[PDB]
């Protein structure tokens, strides 16, 4: 007969100082926090793909409705939601005519195929944005469905292309015309490959939000943030390319209230432990990375950071924390929190079919708790979790911090995500793209990456 605690939904801030829980509703009602003066979009893609892009841009202005429109709200239109213009007139299109595409389709090694395709796209993008003065706000690279269909089960395109263009410090967005014109894609009997007729509005919502974020605009931010607080989290990856397994890649991700995180690359080091599986940094590179992040916060805010909230699915040994405490100043709170989602604590309801909410909390001790970031949502009248939700297990590995405070903070931090305009996602954003950012890091290892925003 144990107790449960519910933490109220953390509102996110929008334009005109307006805060509401749903990013889609807030965007449609008030617009992004910082407006911009249009999206001078540049698109690389086939001539047919260019036609798809133009048709989608025309479709965006006119409203799009979902099947139910109660769990996936409507799409008013680009200038109706964001107050800025983006269409097929101020467009800088680059001819990547499929002749070279069919030349580059001759290879049979999938890794080499995706590698050379990413190099060709990267070269086209950099030539376009460096040869002329036409300031392209976002490079919308549209990959033909054949290219990704024949090169998808590194092998992924998004990770390596983003790594290359962040080396070239250039924003980009990957799109597929099947995601754009699924109506024009049909199977043998004419049925759509992916029936978006019920989720067309949400598809437009997420594409528009990603496009606006990629243009240097900040759609929303957490509106009830503590004064003078940051959240420096952490991400690991194992470099299986090397014969010696112990070497691994690490990357810090520092997030302020704004939600546009900054990724600091870490030098390759021997932290992969095949015995336990939990990686630990050597004191030297760990303290180097912590100093880098601290100085980045100092130069970005004229003051020291206060919360290196090292979020990970692993543990930290004693020497790591000793080095971190040595680096951090005396007037700084250091907390290292381990977050995992593999602990079975499914709380089935007594009756009915609709599962438990998102946001229910179960306190175990002063350092560990279970947070329900999936399940039914009272507002959406639906469930983000597909089956019965399994809560995320959070544990304060080291340092002193109130458990409810970190619970509310981690919930609010999960509420912040721009690459997909949804009500929320179960895993934290610091760990949402952990696999994606890790593959980005291993795609470009020897490249020195300065502190740069998450949009790259």
């Amino acid at each position: 007969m144990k107790e449960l605690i519910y933490i109220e939904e953390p509102s996110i801030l929008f334009a005109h100082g307006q805060k509401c829980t749903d990013p889609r509703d807030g965007l449609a009602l008030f617009g992004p926090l910082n407006q911009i003066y249009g999206i001078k979009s540049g698109v690389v893609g086939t001539q047919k793909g260019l036609q798809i892009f133009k048709s989608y841009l025309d479709k965006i202005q006119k409203p799009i409705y979902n099947h139910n429109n109660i769990t996936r709200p409507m799409f008013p239109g680009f200038e109706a939601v964001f107050g800025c213009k983006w269409e097929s007139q101020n467009i800088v299109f680059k001819e990547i005519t499929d002749e070279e595409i069919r030349r580059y389709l001759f290879n049979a090694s999938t890794h080499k195929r995706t590698y050379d395709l990413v190099t060709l796209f990267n070269d086209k993008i950099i030539t376009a944005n460096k040869n002329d003065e036409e300031r392209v706000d976002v490079w919308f690279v549209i990959v033909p469905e054949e290219i990704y269909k024949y090169c998808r089960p590194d092998a992924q395109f998004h990770d390596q292309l983003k790594a290359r263009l962040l080396e070239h410090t250039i924003p980009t967005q990957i799109l597929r015309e099947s995601t754009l014109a699924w109506r024009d894609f049909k199977n043998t009997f004419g049925a759509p490959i992916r029936d978006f007729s019920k989720i067309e509005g949400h598809l437009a919502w997420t594409i528009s939000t990603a496009a606006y974020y990629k243009a240097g605009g900040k759609p929303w931010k957490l509106g009830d943030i503590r004064p003078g607080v940051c959240y420096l989290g952490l991400v690991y990856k194992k470099i299986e390319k090397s014969k010696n397994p112990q070497n691994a890649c690490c990357a810090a991700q520092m997030f302020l209230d704004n939600g546009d995180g900054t990724v600091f690359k870490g030098e390759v080091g021997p932290w992969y432990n095949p015995e336990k599986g939990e990686y630990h940094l050597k004191p030297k590179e760990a303290k180097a990375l912590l100093t880098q992040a601290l100085e980045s916060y100092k130069e970005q805010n004229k003051s020291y950071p206060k919360e290196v909230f090292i979020h990970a699915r692993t543990r930290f040994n004693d020497e790591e924390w000793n080095a971190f405490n040595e680096v951090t100043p005396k007037n700084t709170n250091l907390v290292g929190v381990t977050i995992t989602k593999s602990k079975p604590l499914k709380l089935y309801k007594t009756e009915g079919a609709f599962p438990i909410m998102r946001g229910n909390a179960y306190i175990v001790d002063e350092k560990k708790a279970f947070l329900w970031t999936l399940g039914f949502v009272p507002k959406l009248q639906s469930t983000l979790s597909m089956e019965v939700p399994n809560p995320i297990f959070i544990e304060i590995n080291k340092g002193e911090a109130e458990i409810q405070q970190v619970l509310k903070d981690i919930l609010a931090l999960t509420k912040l995500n721009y690459n997909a305009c949804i009500y929320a996602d179960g895993e934290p954003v610091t760990l949402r793209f952990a696999n994606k950012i890790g593959e980005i890091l291993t795609a470009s290892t020897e490249i020195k990456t300065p502190p740069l925003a998450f949009k790259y």
Binding site: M1, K2, E3, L4, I5, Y6, A15, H16, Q18, K19, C20, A28, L29, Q61, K62, P63, H67, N68, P76, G77, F78, E79, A80, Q156, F157, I174, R176, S178, T179, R194, D195, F196, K198, I199, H202, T206, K341, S342, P344, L345, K346, L347, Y348, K349, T350, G352, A353, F354, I356, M357, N360, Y362, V364, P378, K379, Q381, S382, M386, N435, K436
Partner: protein
């Protein structure tokens, strides 16, 4: 020249545009009148609408939609508006809004065709800007923009019946408490009696190797059944710790700390459960670290235990419910039970390709909600029970562990109101709700769980 702007629409059908226009207009400062903002009201609603049209509005702009072209309410309010426009010689009192892209001029109302309509079907923002400049060019009253009013109205109208309510309700977990433990845990110094090369975990009773010792819940002479030359062992050199003492934590010595003792007990519990599942006429399935246990076809009354189908057909194969057990001690001694689904051709020879298994497990669980999980889990637990309200884990000849059938009952102080059957179309779209970009590696997402 009047007080507030008023708008009509075909409320049953085109509520999205009316919502957008109403909140956008109230946000910029215009005081809007529409039936959308008056949810949970209306007995003489027509009288109020007529009154506000007659003497409480400067504008009346109305949707021109196929649904709203012939609706009786729209027609009558439009007629009242025409009367008011005849009263007040302002010819722009009626503003059709052509949001509908297939309503030509032929079927538009007689007194609306000759009027000048502002286009909204091209884009809502362009139409809104046109309406704004029209409002300014005949001096429509306006208030300074205040989106706080829009936030207050939106949450109290479209979000009043869809909020978490304050009432306590209980749930059902998979944490099954352990009723009782054996009297003591004993480490025997077998030394030369127990060969080191022999794998201890293969023994009939739960026994794990700790240094040169052997830590079990059994007896020194109990273990002579399968391995000889241990009858010479004596009970003096064996070291016994009371289970209540070792699990509580107050026990600590140079021989063994309270940290590794709990892990050893957890491993013993897991091994005991795995051994006990052997004779429960269930079938085993190997996993990454643990084992799953399910029911074969034809081993129950039409494969139903207490009106619950633990086994069922699907297309050309069969699915069976199964559980995996893992103990823990820190938040009271409990046993986690994880639910899985195992696929078979008819009732035997599971599909060798685990890829199809885990891929179609999602499509088999997509249609199983909270009830079709809890009921099946409790049915499986009750089936595995031996006596009335417990499960027996045989660790020793006289020592056994008791696991309660009823799982722990958590309860939350926040509840909600379950709506009607809405999920019918969800399973169709959650197969595509991960396809919004399709860029995320589905295979890597499954592997990222580990």
């Amino acid at each position: 020249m009047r007080n507030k702007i008023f708008i009509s629409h075909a409320t049953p059908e085109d509520d999205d545009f009316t919502r957008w226009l109403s909140l956008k207009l109230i946000g910029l400062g215009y005081e809007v009148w529409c039936d959308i903002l008056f949810l949970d009201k209306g007995v003489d609603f027509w009288s109020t609408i007529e009154k506000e049209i007659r003497e409480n509005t400067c504008k009346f702009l109305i949707v021109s939609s196929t649904a709203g072209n012939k609706r009786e309410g729209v027609l009558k309010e439009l007629a009242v508006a025409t009367k008011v426009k005849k009263h007040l010689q302002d010819d722009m009192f009626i503003i059709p809004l052509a949001i509908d892209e297939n309503l030509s001029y032929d079927d538009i109302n007689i007194e609306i065709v000759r009027l000048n309509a502002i286009d909204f079907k091209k884009s809502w923002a362009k139409g809104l800007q046109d309406l704004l400049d029209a409002f300014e060019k005949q001096n429509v009253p306006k208030k300074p923009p205040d989106h706080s009013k829009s936030n207050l109205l939106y949450q109290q109208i479209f979000l009043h019946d869809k909020q978490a309510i304050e009432k306590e309700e209980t749930y059902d977990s998979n944490w099954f408490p352990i009723i009782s433990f054996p009297n003591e845990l004993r480490f025997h110094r077998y030394d030369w009696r127990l060969p080191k090369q022999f794998d201890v975990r293969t023994l009939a009773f739960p026994a794990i190797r700790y240094k040169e010792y052997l830590c079990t819940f059994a007896w020194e002479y109990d273990f002579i059944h399968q391995l000889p030359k241990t009858e010479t062992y004596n009970g003096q050199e064996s070291i016994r710790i009371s289970t209540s003492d070792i699990l509580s934590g107050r026990y600590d010595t140079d021989f063994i700390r309270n940290y590794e003792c709990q892990r050893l007990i957890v491993q013993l519990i897991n091994k005991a459960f795995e051994l006990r599942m052997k004779d429960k006429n269930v079938r085993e399935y190997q996993m990454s670290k643990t084992f799953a246990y399910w029911i074969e076809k034809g081993k129950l009354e039409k494969d139903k235990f207490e009106k619950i189908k633990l086994v069922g057909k699907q297309k050309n194969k069969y699915w069976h419910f199964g559980i995996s057990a893992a103990g823990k001690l820190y938040p009271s001694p409990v046993l986690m039970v994880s639910s899985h689904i195992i696929f078979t051709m008819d009732g035997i020879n599971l599909i060798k390709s685990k890829s199809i298994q885990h891929s179609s497990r999602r499509k088999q669980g997509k249609n199983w909600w909270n009830d079709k999980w809890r009921e099946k889990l409790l049915a499986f637990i009750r089936f595995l029970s031996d006596d009335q309200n417990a499960i027996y884990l045989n660790v020793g000849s006289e020592e056994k562990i008791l696991i309660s059938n009823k799982p722990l009952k958590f309860f939350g102080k926040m509840s909600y109101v379950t709506p009607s059957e809405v999920t019918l179309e969800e399973e169709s779209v959650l197969a595509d709700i991960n396809n919004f970009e399709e860029d995320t590696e589905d295979l890597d997402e499954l592997e990222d769980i580990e």
